[PDB]
Write a protein that binds this ligand. Structure first.
Ligand code: CHL
Ligand code: CLA
Ligand code: CLA
Ligand code: CLA
Ligand code: CLA
Ligand code: CLA
Ligand SMILES: CCCCCCCCCCCCCCCCCC(=O)OC[C@H](CO[C@@H]1O[C@H](CO)[C@H](O)[C@H](O)[C@H]1O)OC(=O)CCCCCCCCCCCCCCCCC
Ligand SMILES: CCCCCCCCCCCCCCCCCC(=O)O[C@@H](COC(=O)CCCCCCCCCCCCCCC)COP(=O)(O)OC[C@H](O)CO
Ligand SMILES: CC1=C[C@H](O)CC(C)(C)[C@H]1/C=C/C(C)=C/C=C/C(C)=C/C=C/C=C(C)/C=C/C=C(C)/C=C/C1=C(C)C[C@H](O)CC1(C)C
Ligand SMILES: CC1=C[C@H](O)CC(C)(C)[C@H]1/C=C/C(C)=C/C=C/C(C)=C/C=C/C=C(C)/C=C/C=C(C)/C=C/C1=C(C)C[C@H](O)CC1(C)C
Ligand SMILES: CC1=C(/C=C/C(C)=C/C=C/C(C)=C/C=C/C=C(C)/C=C/C=C(C)/C=C/C2=C(C)CCCC2(C)C)C(C)(C)CCC1
Lengths: 193, 42, 198, 153, 97
C-alpha cells in the first residue's frame, strides 16, 4: 500500500501491476475508465523512459542540454545538429512535417486494437526476445516496468521544475551544483529567496 | 422585581443598553487612540 | 486526584475523569463532542511536549550564558547566527522529516495501532499501546507510564505553554531576554512589573 | 514607492496640507484671547492635527500626488497593517458575534415557545454563551469537520 | 519558397492522412453524429431541403472516399501550405527570444 494505515479504495484490489491503492480523488471508479487510465499511464511512462536518457546523455557528451537542442528552431533559418554535425534537411517545416506524418499512422494502428491487454502489452513483433512467455516473470516485468516508469515520470517533473527554477541550463549542471556544496545550494534557496 | 427584570430583558431595552455601552466604548477608544488609519502595533 | 479549577463550579458531563489531568476546565464547551476531545487530548500532549523542549531551549542556554559557562546567543537572536548550512536547507530537511514522522503520528491518531510496524525491517514493531504514549523504542529506559506520570507530564506541559506565552509576550513588550526580565524583577520588584513596562 | 506613491513622511504635499490646516486653525484662533476655553480647544485641535500628521508619516503610509495617504490592499508585507491585520481582527470579532448568536439560537431551539426567548432575551444563557465566541475558530473548524455546522434538511 | 511544390506537397499529405490514417475514426464519428430534431432527422421532420445527397456522396473508391472528403482535406492542405508560405516569406514573428 502507498500509505500505510490507510484503507484501500473499493475500485482497486491490488491485482493490477503496481496497484498500491492510491486514488485519493477516485478517478478510476468506472472499470473501463480505469482500463483507459492504465493504457494512458503506460504510454506516459514509456515516453518518459525514452525521455530520461535522451535528456541526460546529450548533456553528458557536451552537446548542450535538452533546452539548447530546441534553440535552433527559435532562430530564423536555424539548422539542427546531430553529434555536432548539421543535418542538411533539418529545418523546422520539414522536421514538423515528417513528425506529423510518421507520428501519425503509428499512433493510429495503436488505436485499431480493441483488446485491452493488447492495447497495454501488444506482444508479437514488439516482444522479440520472448520475455512474456513465462507468466510469473511476465507479471514481475510488468511491476518492474510500472515502477521504473513512475520513477521516470517523477524524473521528468524534476526536469521541468528544475528548468523553470534555473532557466537555460541542464539537469547535470544542477547535479554538479548540488555536489559542489550540498548544504548551501538546493531547493531551499528558491523555496525561500 | 422579576417582572421589571423581564422588562429589562426585552428587545429594545437590552438593545439600547448594549448599543449604548458599545458606543461609549468606541467613543472612549477614539478619544484615547484618535485618527487611526492603520494597525501599527505589529 | 481529579480536583477542580473552580471549587464552586461543577464538572462537565464529558469530563468524568478517565483522562489524565482532568480538572473540569472546559468553560467554553470546546470538547463536548467525543471526537473533538480525542483530537484535543493529542493536540494538548504534542503542544505541551514541544513547549517543554522550547522553554528549556530559550531558558537554560540563556541562564548558562548569564552565568558565564557558555556564550550562546539569545533565542530571538539565534536565527541570524552562522551554521554549516543555511536556514533554508535546514527548513527543507526539517519539513521532509517532520512530514514523514507527523504523517505516521496522524495515522496512529486516526486509527490506533496501525503504524506500529517498521516499513523497512518488518521484524521490528512497537508493542500495543494507547494513543499518544507510544512505547517501545520511544521509551528506552522502560519507565512505567502510570497515570501519575501522565498527570505530571500534562501539568508540566501546561506550565511550559504558559511559560512560552509569557516568553513571546515579554519579548514583544520589552525586547530583552526572559531571564533578564527575571533579573530586573529581582532587582526591585515593586517598580519592575507589568505596569512600568507600559 | 508602490504604484508610484511617495511615502507620507517624504511628501511635500502632505506637509502642505498640514500647513493649510494649521493656518486655518490659527486664523480661527486669532479671534479669542489665549487664556479662554475656545482658545484652549483650538490649541488642542491643532496639537491633535500635528500628532495625526506625524503618526501618518511615521506609520509608513504611501501618499499620492494629492497629498493624501493611499491604502494598499494587495497584500504587501510593508502594508499589512492597513487592511490585512484590521481585516483579521474584524473577521475574528464578526465570527465571535455570529457564533454567539448561532449558539443562542441553537440553545433556545428546543423549547415550548422559542419565540418568547427572542423578543425577551434570556440574559443568563446569553451571558454564559458570550465568551464561547472567544474560541470561535476552533469550535467552527471542529463543527465543520464533524458535520455539525451545516444542516442537510 | 516555390508555391506549386509546397501546395502540392501539403495537399497530397493531407489527402493521404484523410484517406489512410484518419479515415476510420472520421467515418465512425459521422456514423455517431447525425443532426436530429425532436428525436427525428431534419429531412424526415418535414424539411424538404435537408435531404442528404446520396448521389454526391456515392463513390467507387474501395474505402468510400467521396468528393466531399476530397474537398475538406484539400482545404486543410491548401490552408497549411499557404500558412507555411506566408510564414517562410516573413523573416520575423516570435524570433527575438
Ligand atoms: C517554532 C517556531 C519558530 C518561531 C516562533 C520563531 C521565531 C522567531 N524567529 Mg526563527 N522561529 C521559529 C522557527 C525557525 N526559525 C528559523 C530561523 C530563523 C531565521 C534565519 C531568523 C529567524 C527569526 C525569528 C524571529 C522573527 C521571525 C522570531 C524570534 C529572525 C530573527 O532572528 O529576528 C529578526 C531571522 O532572521 N528565525 C528556522 C530555520 C529556518 C526555524 C525552523 O522551524
Ligand atoms: C524519446 C525520443 C527522443 C527524442 C524525441 C529525441 C530528440 C532529439 N535528440 Mg535524443 N536521444 C534519445 C531519445 C530521443 N531524442 C535516446 C534514447 C538517446 C540515446 C541513444 C538519445 C541521444 C541523443 C543526440 C541527440 C539529439 C537529439 C536532437 C536531434 C535529433 C536528430 O535526429 O538530429 C533531438 C531534439 C542531438 C542533440 O544532442 O542535440 C543537439 C544529438 O546529437 N539525442
Ligand atoms: C526522482 C528523484 C529526484 C532526484 C534524485 C532529484 C535530484 C536533485 N534535485 Mg530535483 N526534483 C524532483 C525529482 C528529483 N530531483 C522533483 C519531482 C521535483 C519537483 C518538486 C524536483 C525539483 C527540484 C528543484 C526545485 C531543485 C532540484 C534540485 C535537485 C538537486 C538537490 C536538491 C534537492 O533535490 O531538493 C529536494 C527536491 C525535492 C523535494 C523533489 C522531490 C525529490 C524526492 C526525494 C524524490 C538534485 C540534483 C535543486 C538544484 O537545482 O540543485 C542545486 C533544486 O533547486 N529539484
Ligand atoms: C465601510 C466601512 C467603514 C470602514 C471600514 C471604516 C473605517 C474606519 N473608520 Mg470610518 N465611517 C464609516 C464607515 C467605515 N469606516 C461611516 C459610515 C461613517 C459615518 C457614520 C464613518 C465615520 C468615521 C469617523 C467619525 C471616524 C472613522 C474612523 C475610522 C477608522 C477606525 C476607527 C478607530 O479608530 O478604530 C480603533 C479600533 C477599534 C475600535 C477596534 C475595537 C476592537 C475591540 C476593542 C476588541 C479588541 C479585541 C480583543 C477606520 C479608518 C476614525 C478615523 O479617525 O479615521 C481615520 C474616526 O474618527 N470613521
Ligand atoms: C494547546 C492547546 C491546548 C489544548 C488543545 C488543550 C486541550 C484540553 N484541555 Mg488543556 N490546558 C492548556 C492547553 C491546551 N489544552 C493550558 C495552556 C492549560 C493551563 C492554563 C491547560 C489546562 C487544562 C485544565 C486545567 C484542563 C484541561 C483540559 C482540557 C481538555 C478539554 C478542553 C478543551 O478541549 O479545550 C480545547 C482547547 C484549545 C483548542 C486551546 C486553543 C487556544 C484558544 C482558542 C485561545 C488561545 C489563548 C491563549 C491565551 C493565547 C482537552 C484535553 C480539561 C481536562 O479534562 O483534561 C483532560 C481540564 O480540566 N486543560
Ligand atoms: C508562568 C508564569 C509567568 C511568570 C513567572 C512570569 C514572570 C514575569 N513576568 Mg510574564 N507573562 C506570563 C507568564 C509569566 N510571567 C504570561 C502568560 C503573559 C501573557 C499575559 C506574560 C506577560 C508579561 C508582560 C506583558 C510583562 C511580564 C513581566 C513579568 C515580570 C514582572 C511582573 C509583571 O509586571 O507582571 C506579570 C504579568 C502577568 C500577566 C502575570 C501572568 C502570570 C500567569 C497568569 C500565571 C500565574 C500562575 C501561577 C500562580 C504562577 C515577571 C518576572 C513584565 C516585565 O517585563 O518584567 C520586567 C511585563 O511587562 N509578563
Ligand atoms: C418614583 C419612581 C419609582 C417608580 C417605581 C415604584 C412604584 C412602582 C410599583 C412597585 O414598586 O410595585 C412593586 C413591584 C412588585 O411588587 C409586588 O410584587 C409581587 C411579586 O411577588 C406581586 O407582583 C405584587 O402584585 C407586586 O405589587 O416591584 C417591582 O417589580 C418594582 C421593581 C423595581 C422598580 C424600580 C424603579 C426604577 C425604575 C422606574 C421606572
Ligand atoms: C479550500 C478547499 C475546500 C474543499 C472543500 C470540499 C471538500 C468536501 C467538503 C465536505 C465538508 O465540508 O465536510 C468534510 C469536512 O471538511 C473538510 O474536510 C474540508 C475542510 C476545509 C478547510 C481546510 C481546507 C484546507 C485549508 C488550507 C489552509 C467531511 O465531513 P463529512 O461529510 O464526512 O461529515 C459527515 C458527518 O460526520 C456526519 O456523518
Ligand atoms: C518491451 C520489449 C519488447 C521486446 O520483445 C524485447 C525488448 C526490446 C528488450 C523490450 C524493450 C525494452 C526497452 C526498450 C527498455 C527500455 C528501458 C528504459 C529506457 C528505461 C528508463 C528508465 C528511466 C528511469 C528509471 C529514470 C530515472 C531518473 C532519475 C532517477 C532522475 C534523476 C535526476 C538526476 C540524477 C539529476 C537531476 O538534476 C534531477 C533528476 C532528473 C530527477
Ligand atoms: C484549555 C481550554 C479550555 C476552555 O474550555 C477554553 C480555553 C480557555 C480557550 C482553552 C484554552 C486554554 C489555554 C490557556 C490555552 C493555551 C495554549 C498555549 C499558550 C499553548 C502554547 C504552546 C507553545 C508551544 C508548543 C511552544 C513551542 C516552542 C518551541 C518549538 C521553541 C522553539 C525555539 C527554541 C527552543 C529556541 C530557538 O532559539 C527559538 C525557537 C526556534 C522559537
Ligand atoms: C483520381 C484518383 C487519383 C488521384 C487523385 C488526386 C490527384 C486528387 C487531387 C485532389 C486535389 C488536388 C484536391 C484539392 C482540393 C482543394 C480545395 C478543395 C481547396 C482548397 C482551398 C481553399 C478551401 C481555400 C484557399 C484559400 C484561398 C481562397 C486564398 C486565401 C487563402 C486560402 C488558403 C484560405 C489516384 C491516382 C490517387 C488514384 C486513382 C483515383
Amino acid at each position: 500500500e502507498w500509505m500505510p494505515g490507510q484503507p484501500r479504495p473499493a475500485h482497486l484490489d491490488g491485482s493490477a501491476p503496481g496497484d498500491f491503492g492510491f486514488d485519493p480523488l477516485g478517478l478510476g471508479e468506472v472499470p473501463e475508465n480505469l482500463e483507459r487510465f492504465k493504457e494512458s499511464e503506460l504510454i506516459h511512462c514509456r515516453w518518459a523512459m525514452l525521455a530520461v536518457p535522451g535528456i541526460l546523455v546529450p548533456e553528458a557528451l557536451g552537446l548542450g542540454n535538452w533546452v539548447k537542442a530546441q534553440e535552433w528552431a527559435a532562430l530564423p533559418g536555424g539548422q539542427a545538429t546531430y553529434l555536432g554535425n548539421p543535418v542538411p534537411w533539418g529545418n523546422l517545416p520539414t522536421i514538423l512535417a515528417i513528425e506529423f506524418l510518421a507520428i501519425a499512422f503509428v499512433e493510429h494502428q495503436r488505436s485499431m486494437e480493441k483488446d485491452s491487454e493488447k492495447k497495454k502489452y501488444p506482444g508479437g513483433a514488439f516482444d522479440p526476445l520472448g520475455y512474456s512467455k513465462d507468466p510469473k516473470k511476465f507479471e514481475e516485468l510488468k511491476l518492474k516496468e510500472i515502477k521504473n516508469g513512475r520513477l521516470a515520470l517523477l524524473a521528468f517533473v524534476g526536469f521541468c521544475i528544475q528548468q523553470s527554477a534555473y532557466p537555460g541550463t541542464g539537469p547535470l549542471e544542477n547535479l554538479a551544483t548540488h555536489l559542489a556544496d550540498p548544504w548551501h545550494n538546493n531547493i531551499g534557496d528558491i523555496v525561500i529567496p | 422585581m422579576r417582572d421589571f427584570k423581564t422588562y429589562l430583558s426585552v428587545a429594545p431595552v437590552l438593545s439600547t443598553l448594549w448599543f449604548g455601552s458599545l458606543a461609549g466604548l468606541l467613543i472612549e477608544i477614539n478619544r484615547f487612540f484618535p485618527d487611526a488609519l492603520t494597525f501599527p502595533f505589529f | 486526584k481529579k480536583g477542580e479549577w473552580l471549587p464552586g463550579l461543577a464538572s462537565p458531563g464529558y469530563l468524568t475523569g478517565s483522562l489524565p489531568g482532568d480538572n473540569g476546565f472546559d468553560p467554553l464547551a470546546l470538547a463536548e463532542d467525543p471526537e473533538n476531545l480525542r483530537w484535543f487530548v493529542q493536540a494538548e500532549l504534542v503542544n505541551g511536549r514541544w513547549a517543554m523542549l522550547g522553554v528549556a531551549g530559550m531558558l537554560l542556554p540563556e541562564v548558562f550564558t548569564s552565568i558565564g559557562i557558555i556564550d550562546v546567543p539569545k533565542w530571538y537572536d539565534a536565527g541570524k547566527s552562522e551554521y554549516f548550512a543555511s536556514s533554508s536547507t535546514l527548513f527543507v530537511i526539517e519539513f521532509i522529516l517532520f512530514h514523514y514522522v507527523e504523517i505516521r503520528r496522524w495515522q496512529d491518531i486516526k486509527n490506533p495501532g496501525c503504524v506500529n510496524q517498521d516499513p523497512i525491517f518488518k521484524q521490528y514493531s512497537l508493542p500495543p499501546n494507547e494513543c499518544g504514549y507510544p512505547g517501545g523504542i520511544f521509551n528506552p529506559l522502560n519507565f512505567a507510564p502510570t497515570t501519575e506520570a501522565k498527570e505530571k507530564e500534562l501539568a508540566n506541559g501546561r506550565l511550559a505553554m504558559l511559560a512560552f506565552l509569557g516568553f513571546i509576550v515579554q519579548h514583544n513588550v520589552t525586547g530583552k531576554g526572559p531571564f533578564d526580565n527575571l533579573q530586573q524583577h529581582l532587582s526591585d520588584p515593586w517598580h519592575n512589573t507589568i505596569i512600568q513596562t507600559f | 514607492d508602490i504604484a508610484g506613491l511617495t511615502p507620507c513622511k517624504e511628501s511635500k504635499q502632505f506637509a502642505k496640507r498640514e500647513k493649510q490646516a494649521l493656518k486655518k486653525l490659527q486664523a480661527s484662533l486669532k479671534l479669542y484671547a489665549d487664556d479662554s476655553a475656545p482658545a484652549l480647544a483650538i490649541k488642542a485641535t491643532m496639537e491633535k492635527t500635528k500628532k495625526r500628521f506625524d503618526n501618518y508619516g511615521k506609520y509608513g503610509l504611501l501618499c499620492g500626488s494629492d497629498g493624501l495617504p493611499h491604502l494598499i490592499v494587495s497584500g504587501d508585507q510593508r502594508h499589512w497593517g492597513e487592511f490585512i491585520t484590521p481585516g483579521i481582527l474584524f473577521l475574528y470579532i464578526a465570527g465571535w458575534i455570529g457564533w454567539v448568536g448561532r449558539s443562542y439560537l441553537i440553545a433556545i431551539r428546543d423549547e415550548k415557545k422559542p419565540t418568547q426567548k427572542e423578543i425577551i432575551i434570556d440574559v443568563p444563557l446569553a451571558s454564559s454563551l458570550l465568551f464561547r465566541g472567544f474560541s470561535w475558530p476552533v469550535a467552527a473548524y471542529r463543527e465543520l469537520l464533524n458535520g455539525e455546522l451545516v444542516d442537510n434538511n | 519558397l516555390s508555391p506549386s511544390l509546397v501546395i502540392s506537397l501539403s495537399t497530397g499529405l493531407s489527402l493521404f492522412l484523410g484517406r489512410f490514417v484518419f479515415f476510420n475514426f472520421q467515418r465512425e464519428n459521422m456514423a455517431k453524429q447525425v443532426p436530429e430534431q425532436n428525436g427525428m432527422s431534419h429531412f424526415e421532420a418535414g424539411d424538404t431541403r435537408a435531404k442528404e445527397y446520396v448521389s454526391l456522396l456515392k463513390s467507387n473508391d474501395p474505402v468510400g472516399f467521396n468528393i466531399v472528403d476530397v474537398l475538406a482535406w484539400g482545404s486543410i492542405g491548401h490552408i497549411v501550405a499557404y500558412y507555411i508560405l506566408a510564414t517562410a516569406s516573413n523573416g520575423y514573428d516570435p524570433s527575438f527570444f
